[PDB]
Amino acid sequence: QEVKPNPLQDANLCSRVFFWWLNPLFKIGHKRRLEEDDMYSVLPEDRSQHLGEELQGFWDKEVLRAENDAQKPSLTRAIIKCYWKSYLVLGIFTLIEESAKVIQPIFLGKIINYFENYDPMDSVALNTAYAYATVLTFCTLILAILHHLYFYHVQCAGMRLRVAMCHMIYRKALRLSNMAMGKTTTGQIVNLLSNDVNKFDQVTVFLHFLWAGPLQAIAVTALLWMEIGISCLAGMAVLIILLPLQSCFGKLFSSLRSKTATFTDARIRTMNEVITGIRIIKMYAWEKSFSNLITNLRKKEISKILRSSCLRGMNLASFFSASKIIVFVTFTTYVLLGSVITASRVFVAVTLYGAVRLTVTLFFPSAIERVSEAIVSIRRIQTFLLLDEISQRNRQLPSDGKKMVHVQDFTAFWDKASETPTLQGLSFTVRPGELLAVVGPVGAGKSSLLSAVLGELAPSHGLVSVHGRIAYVSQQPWVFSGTLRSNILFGKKYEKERYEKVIKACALKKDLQLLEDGDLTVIGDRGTTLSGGQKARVNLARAVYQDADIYLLDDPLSAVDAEVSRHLFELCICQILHEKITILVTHQLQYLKAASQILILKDGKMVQKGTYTEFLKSEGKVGFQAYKNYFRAGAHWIVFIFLILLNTAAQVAYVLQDWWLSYWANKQSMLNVTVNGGGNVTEKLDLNWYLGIYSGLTVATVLFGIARSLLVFYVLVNSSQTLHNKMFESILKAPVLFFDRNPIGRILNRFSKDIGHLDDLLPLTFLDFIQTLLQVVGVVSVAVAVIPWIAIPLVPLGIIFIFLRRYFLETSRDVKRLESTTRSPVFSHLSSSLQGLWTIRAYKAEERCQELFDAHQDLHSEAWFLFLTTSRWFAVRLDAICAMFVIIVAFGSLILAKTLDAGQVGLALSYALTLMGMFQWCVRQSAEVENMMISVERVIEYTDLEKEAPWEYQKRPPPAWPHEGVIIFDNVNFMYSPGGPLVLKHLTALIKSQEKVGIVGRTGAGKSSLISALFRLSEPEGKIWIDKILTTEIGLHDLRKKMSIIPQEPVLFTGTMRKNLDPFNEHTDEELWNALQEVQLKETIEDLPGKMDTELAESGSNFSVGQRQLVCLARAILRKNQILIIDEATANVDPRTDELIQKKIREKFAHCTVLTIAHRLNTIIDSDKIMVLDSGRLKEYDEPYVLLQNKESLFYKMVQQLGKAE
């Protein structure tokens, strides 16, 4: 559509400055939920194609110049040569803004200096002070409402660089060579596009500071000198000292993080090991072992996390109290040098120190870090872009409608570095319409035969006159993101008649029936809605629809059946490919005989070139409940009272440190009045008292900041630890139904991402938000204290802010969500192009895929533009509120000048000059915290999920409970869900003492239900007395312990073979030695390189499945129970191992009551008695002879059906 042309086009200068043109969007964003249709298209100069072309031109010129002067080309040179003009133009406003920030304290001092020499009858001084205040508010308006357009333009420059770089990367990837593709991997390129290019969105934000920081600071120092002389240096010294030390501590921080990561990873692995195999763990009564293992891992991880959090809290406290330390040092030096403090100089120095400290300790190091990251990103992208590309497709020879085709001395090597030739002898000619049947097992040389159409195995010199259009269908059929309209069309015009004829004769009605929409069905992500059959069929349909000349079919008949294959043979290969090239590799041996000519090769050796005659025969809101539950999990509410008291004390001391300077200045002014106007004796202010109180106030500020940071971090980390412990304990007791309903990925995500948030990000962000909110409250309270009437206009302004906040968030979140959902298509399209790059090059469809990628990137560019602009809109309005507050303070000081003195005016104005940045920081952090508390909500949701019966009761059965071996079923009705499906109907069974029996079901219908009922892990709704005791009165663990089972899929847990064989160490060592030697597995584990404590791989990946049944049988043998369950229903199980383990449990268990469930009837025929059971109804209970004789007996029914005999 002509979607709303970016109203930035028609917005005048005022509207662009205030982002007024964004107002309509918010309206709909408040009325309903934003979608992709309510979006704004990128500006014509921001289209991905345009930026890509311009940067391609610049980079090509740079490469040509580098070749001319014989040096390695530099991508940074090209980027600079491209964007330097538009960035140096933007630097003018950053110079203006730095100058404004520097010169604002000068006029603040002018106002205070007016207040110092107050004379109520001097009107000229009043007018001059009003002019100074007007200049001050002009400067603060420049800082507040004018900086945001410049910030948006800077971020646009970064986004332009990112988009151009992505276009470069895709254009290169589509032209990569085969061996270069082998050297790298698609994951590396997707990472290049995903995280390695996002750095350009950040560096540009602070790039100019690289020269603004060192310059502005110098200016500030000069100004500070002009105020307070050499004393200023002392303060500057502390600031300089603050740069290395903090950075140094940062290094230590990183180190600690690394350690925690390892522990976290280990813990997460076990989480997977627990969640993926939870059925087996609960089945084996092994919850205690994994519980204590995870407890140890979590304890170590939380110790490292506590250390890291203490370090980060110390850093935050230092950042908070650095201003106080700087001011205290500089003014102690000032007074001790023999000077006399005055309010004007004191607060000019305070404001200048605040500005320069914020710069030096926030912007400059961030600028350095982001520039270094961007430099390494540019290095990676450049070394990718110089990767050798596929030999450029040379212009085809005239090919005047001839069929001159001959391959001689075919040089085809997969690996050039390999001394062995990949292929040596390959020489054949293809005739129009004729079919050549290529055969090779598991891809034995089909790749060389197939690329022999000049795909990727081209000879270094010469050219083979292959004429026509190549239609290559790969082993892996591929569907790019879009609609079936796109894959069908693929650049070709919409051919109604031939589309219809192929769609009806080829019988694609399966898509119409299966797909809810038809041929317009929007392909889901990665084509999960479709299947490999559809992808293969659409590959053949694309090839036939584009009706190319050379048809390269890499076994497309494997996915389709023989009928559809012969159908396309007649319709396409016979009729449509009647005079077209039909290079068709085929297997399954039926199209080999269905074809006319066959070609088989083996390692550059042509097997045969004969026909069959050769006889080959081959989100929402988070309530107060969430915050309350998050906090009460940390510490007693007494501790929280102590914490808020400590926070209040820290902020009060922070403000009182500056108030003491103001009071000192006022007292010195009165003293000077007394010693000049009054008494002649120049009385000296007692330096000991004032300096001591000043030092005490700054020391108290430092100590209280440190203590508050440490306590907040400790209580929040302890809350996280308690929440994790509760959540894991609850999940370990969760019934199997919870794990069945919830996917493993969901639970693992809850245990990984949410816990990581609560451990790393949430405490830090919460502490920062509390700090900044308290600072804002301090500034507002100072202003209200100096001028009480400021309370009157503060009530409206704050109210407005609240409403504004809502009106922004209702849209902002939506935009954020949009920006998240429009970014994955780019990566998925890149992955799809890389996967099927062969056929993309085959069709010469590079430009079409480039356009598709450009559209995919343009959509995300719309999302990113909306995100940037809405953020700037909110920032403009917030800073306008702050500037209104500053104007109110500065002018109300002058209006109520009769009742104010220099110290109060200086203090209030100096704090108002920082309210702006503090408020912006605090609002954004508050939003960030409110967004992150969803992880806390999810964790708390898991902490109270429903649990099953307790493992152990206070009452216990005798330890020799399985003394008889009799278990019976008395009218048990298993119910997975109340009122749901019926799985057991009045199930009644009588199993004799010490009797080996099995049952058979119907493809799992009632098979696993019996095991679930016996083990009670899914709570059978049945009433049972095995050995005349109700199954309820034995606890979960006390029942499962004397409950031996062999699962269908044996599982292996990471750890020592000793721990996997016996995790509770309830069996003495020589017991395992002897038992495993009896099953001759001791020699097998002894030859393992690690011997007894062998480091098991990831769930025994190297261990064979036979060893898996072996180890499970060993577990059963050590368990030494009187019953045992054989759940032998796996299909792909090794027969040699099966005969083994059958003779094992026949000879080892012997006289132990076994319940055998299986699908192999032979494994039950050996059992003395068979109880046929299906659909909850006891079908057979009689003699085996009666079962053999009875025609209606289900056992005899299957006996007749499979055909086996005794």
Ligand SMILES: C[C@@H]1CC[C@@]2(OC1)O[C@H]1C[C@H]3[C@@H]4CC=C5C[C@@H](OCCC(CO)CO)CC[C@]5(C)[C@H]4CC[C@]3(C)[C@H]1[C@@H]2C
């Ligand atoms: C952003 C830029 C920062 C620098 C700057 O431009 C803007 O800021 C401006 C503020 C100006 C002063 C304002 C008022 C007065 C009072 C007047 O006395 C007669 C009083 C009369 C009302 O003014 C009623 O009788 C003498 C001149 C003086 C001191 C100005 C000097 C020039 C100054 C410093 C200007 C300077 C070039």
Ligand SMILES: C[C@@H]1CC[C@@]2(OC1)O[C@H]1C[C@H]3[C@@H]4CC=C5C[C@@H](OCCC(CO)CO)CC[C@]5(C)[C@H]4CC[C@]3(C)[C@H]1[C@@H]2C
């Ligand atoms: C190392 C860091 C970087 C650079 C820098 O900071 C520290 O080094 C400082 C040196 C300072 C000057 C020293 C002396 C004077 C002379 C005085 O007057 C004349 C006095 C006397 C002769 O006549 C009696 O009159 C006026 C001020 C001036 C020029 C200083 C200006 C600021 C300067 C340039 C500072 C500058 C920002």
Ligand SMILES: C[C@@H]1CC[C@@]2(OC1)O[C@H]1C[C@H]3[C@@H]4CC=C5C[C@@H](OCCC(CO)CO)CC[C@]5(C)[C@H]4CC[C@]3(C)[C@H]1[C@@H]2C
């Ligand atoms: C990175 C650094 C942090 C702090 C620091 O520099 C930068 O701050 C500076 C202040 C310096 C003193 C200033 C003046 C004098 C001159 C002379 O005595 C004349 C008496 C004096 C008062 O009457 C006239 O100015 C002797 C030297 C002395 C005391 C300086 C010593 C070094 C001091 C303490 C420097 C100190 C190391």
Ligand SMILES: C[C@@H]1CC[C@@]2(OC1)O[C@H]1C[C@H]3[C@@H]4CC=C5C[C@@H](OCCC(CO)CO)CC[C@]5(C)[C@H]4CC[C@]3(C)[C@H]1[C@@H]2C
């Ligand atoms: C963080 C950084 C480390 C600490 C530090 O910088 C910042 O903090 C500064 C405070 C300085 C002192 C302030 C005042 C005086 C009084 C006066 O003593 C003779 C008085 C007479 C002659 O001047 C009449 O004035 C001058 C010297 C002395 C003791 C300073 C010494 C250096 C000191 C300790 C500086 C030190 C390097």
Ligand SMILES: C[C@@H]1CC[C@@]2(OC1)O[C@H]1C[C@H]3[C@@H]4CC=C5C[C@@H](OCCC(CO)CO)CC[C@]5(C)[C@H]4CC[C@]3(C)[C@H]1[C@@H]2C
């Ligand atoms: C007034 C003047 C304004 C400009 C200027 O001087 C002052 O500002 C300086 C900052 C310097 C950069 C600092 C850090 C980095 C990161 C580094 O990446 C490897 C880092 C790794 C190595 O071990 C770990 O440290 C590559 C170099 C780079 C970009 C510097 C380039 C030169 C710069 C821009 C200097 C430049 C001359």
Ligand SMILES: C[C@@H]1CC[C@@]2(OC1)O[C@H]1C[C@H]3[C@@H]4CC=C5C[C@@H](OCCC(CO)CO)CC[C@]5(C)[C@H]4CC[C@]3(C)[C@H]1[C@@H]2C
């Ligand atoms: C238990 C809690 C500990 C913290 C705290 O609460 C209670 O303790 C309170 C003490 C209060 C100060 C007491 C006295 C004055 C002097 C006055 O100046 C007189 C000037 C004079 C000559 O010029 C003419 O009267 C200015 C106000 C000030 C500093 C109070 C400020 C608030 C303070 C700091 C309160 C603070 C929040």
Ligand SMILES: C[C@@H]1CC[C@@]2(OC1)O[C@H]1C[C@H]3[C@@H]4CC=C5C[C@@H](OCCC(CO)CO)CC[C@]5(C)[C@H]4CC[C@]3(C)[C@H]1[C@@H]2C
């Ligand atoms: C709270 C934490 C523990 C201590 C501390 O850190 C923070 O808090 C500060 C309290 C300060 C003292 C306050 C008052 C005075 C009185 C005056 O001496 C007599 C003058 C006059 C009295 O009436 C004569 O009549 C000056 C010195 C002295 C004792 C201060 C010394 C430094 C101290 C101990 C500071 C110390 C570093």
Ligand SMILES: C[C@@H]1CC[C@@]2(OC1)O[C@H]1C[C@H]3[C@@H]4CC=C5C[C@@H](OCCC(CO)CO)CC[C@]5(C)[C@H]4CC[C@]3(C)[C@H]1[C@@H]2C
């Ligand atoms: C809890 C927090 C820590 C402590 C503190 O903040 C709060 O509490 C504040 C109250 C302040 C005092 C207010 C008034 C005066 C009177 C004046 O005149 C004396 C004459 C008069 C009494 O003797 C009649 O004779 C001398 C100074 C003094 C005592 C202030 C000192 C600084 C103090 C202690 C401040 C200090 C930073």
Ligand SMILES: C[C@@H]1CC[C@@]2(OC1)O[C@H]1C[C@H]3[C@@H]4CC=C5C[C@@H](OCCC(CO)CO)CC[C@]5(C)[C@H]4CC[C@]3(C)[C@H]1[C@@H]2C
């Ligand atoms: C919850 C937290 C409790 C502490 C606090 O934050 C919130 O609450 C505020 C209390 C404020 C002081 C109150 C009164 C005055 C007196 C005034 O002197 C003219 C007095 C004269 C006028 O006619 C006689 O009435 C100068 C200003 C001063 C000292 C305030 C300074 C800032 C302070 C300390 C603020 C502090 C940070």
Ligand SMILES: C[C@@H]1CC[C@@]2(OC1)O[C@H]1C[C@H]3[C@@H]4CC=C5C[C@@H](OCCC(CO)CO)CC[C@]5(C)[C@H]4CC[C@]3(C)[C@H]1[C@@H]2C
């Ligand atoms: C989260 C919070 C929001 C706001 C808030 O903190 C943070 O901001 C602080 C500002 C404080 C006031 C500053 C100055 C004065 C003037 C003084 O004058 C009495 C006149 C008479 C007395 O004898 C002769 O002077 C009385 C006290 C009062 C009104 C303070 C009250 C507490 C206030 C309102 C605080 C308030 C709780």
Ligand SMILES: C[C@@H]1CC[C@@]2(OC1)O[C@H]1C[C@H]3[C@@H]4CC=C5C[C@@H](OCCC(CO)CO)CC[C@]5(C)[C@H]4CC[C@]3(C)[C@H]1[C@@H]2C
């Ligand atoms: C959140 C909390 C609310 C309560 C509170 O903390 C924060 O708010 C603070 C405001 C402080 C007062 C501000 C201004 C003055 C005026 C000054 O001058 C009087 C001159 C007059 C006397 O007679 C002439 O006649 C004396 C001190 C006084 C009253 C402060 C006292 C402490 C107070 C009440 C603090 C109190 C504990």
Ligand SMILES: C[C@@H]1CC[C@@]2(OC1)O[C@H]1C[C@H]3[C@@H]4CC=C5C[C@@H](OCCC(CO)CO)CC[C@]5(C)[C@H]4CC[C@]3(C)[C@H]1[C@@H]2C
């Ligand atoms: C809903 C919001 C609640 C808070 C608030 O906004 C609205 O409520 C307002 C009421 C204001 C006070 C009203 C009257 C006076 C008397 C004046 O003189 C006294 C001398 C003598 C002759 O007038 C006595 O009558 C001093 C100032 C003071 C105390 C005001 C201070 C600011 C206040 C507290 C405002 C504050 C910001």
Ligand SMILES: C[C@@H]1CC[C@@]2(OC1)O[C@H]1C[C@H]3[C@@H]4CC=C5C[C@@H](OCCC(CO)CO)CC[C@]5(C)[C@H]4CC[C@]3(C)[C@H]1[C@@H]2C
């Ligand atoms: C102080 C400085 C001067 C003024 C100013 O900057 C700061 O203050 C800002 C606050 C903004 C408003 C915030 C919330 C709303 C409510 C909303 O109510 C939906 C009803 C309607 C719309 O959907 C029907 O649905 C309508 C919009 C409105 C009034 C904003 C308008 C612009 C305003 C006035 C900004 C203005 C430039």
Ligand SMILES: C[C@@H]1CC[C@@]2(OC1)O[C@H]1C[C@H]3[C@@H]4CC=C5C[C@@H](OCCC(CO)CO)CC[C@]5(C)[C@H]4CC[C@]3(C)[C@H]1[C@@H]2C
């Ligand atoms: C733009 C900036 C922000 C707002 C602001 O600065 C400029 O605008 C100023 C207007 C001032 C008031 C003007 C007139 C009077 C009347 C007088 O008589 C009391 C009798 C009765 C009214 O007749 C009240 O009870 C008491 C004082 C008061 C209310 C002023 C208070 C301070 C105010 C609100 C100032 C405020 C800080």
Ligand SMILES: CCCCCCCCCCCCCCCC(=O)O
């Ligand atoms: C000094 C106040 C501003 C700083 C704190 C800003 C964030 C908190 C604002 C109040 C809570 C959110 C508003 C009510 C709930 C909602 O509508 O989302």
